[PDB]
Amino acid sequence: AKRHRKVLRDNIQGITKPAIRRLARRGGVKRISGLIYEETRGVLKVFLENVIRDAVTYTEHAKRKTVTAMDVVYALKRQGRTLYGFGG
């Protein structure tokens, strides 16, 4: 059975264990338990869908199919997370 589906579902597993370890090293974490990574993936997925839904709403207001960087900036700004370096 060489044929399969083109779509992929484990794209949350693309945020690998050493990436979460590096993000914890930037946060000053010395020791990490093994159950941290699934919780971190769930938290990142929740945050990403919260930002992406607002960005998509900003995109469909402009009658567009392309999510620009300014829509992401506005979506982050509305929830209280202002991001610099992309608004100019």
Binding site: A1, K2, R3, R5, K6, V7
Partner: protein, 263 residues
Amino acid sequence: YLFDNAEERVLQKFGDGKMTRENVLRGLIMSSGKMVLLDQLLTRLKKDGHRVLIFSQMVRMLDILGDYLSIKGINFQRLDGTVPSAQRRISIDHFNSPDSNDFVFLLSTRAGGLGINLMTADTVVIFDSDWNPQADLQAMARAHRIGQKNHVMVYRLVSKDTVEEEVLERARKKMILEYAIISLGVTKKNEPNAGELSAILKFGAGNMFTDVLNHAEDLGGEEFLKQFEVTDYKADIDWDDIIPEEELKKLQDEEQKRKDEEY
């Protein structure tokens, strides 16, 4: 079957969803209009003493053909971008061995470079056409090398009234351009050049779209007017014609003996 969740609808609408080792091959053959011609060509070339390369632009369609030959039961070998170079060398040496049981060798069209030797094969089936005609020319020259002992026959598979029509039209225009600039500047005819350039430009401004599978064939300007003709093929083959009594008895006995040996 390149689309997701499309084999299930064909299996549940025609073979009533049981998928019992025989209607899967029927769905593979009768889902696409290229596959009935491919099956007839494969049976005819297996009947004769021919070996065939099959070139595709997609590796997922190569997976579809590999599954078709797996359920069909034909010794095939494969090459695309996923196969590393050691297994590529192994497969090319296995296909070119004099004691080879392989019959069909599948390629993705743009892989392998110009250094693939495919001496032993005779027929080339271009399943999907390329935008660049030089890619298809290199695909045909994989088997049409210096010292070839057999008449190389190329079959190009085209879906009627589809988007592949303008693919072939753009490929024909690019071949016309290459024959204009490159082929007429190689290495009393200057007067007839002003007529034959006009003739080839009238060919370039005209649309090509207005004993059929024979592996045989019985001044240079008329040579280029060949291999641009369109040979329309009509199958009119229903659901129960394929997998004949020889193939159905072999498929049912193999399925019945598999339950006895479990595994």
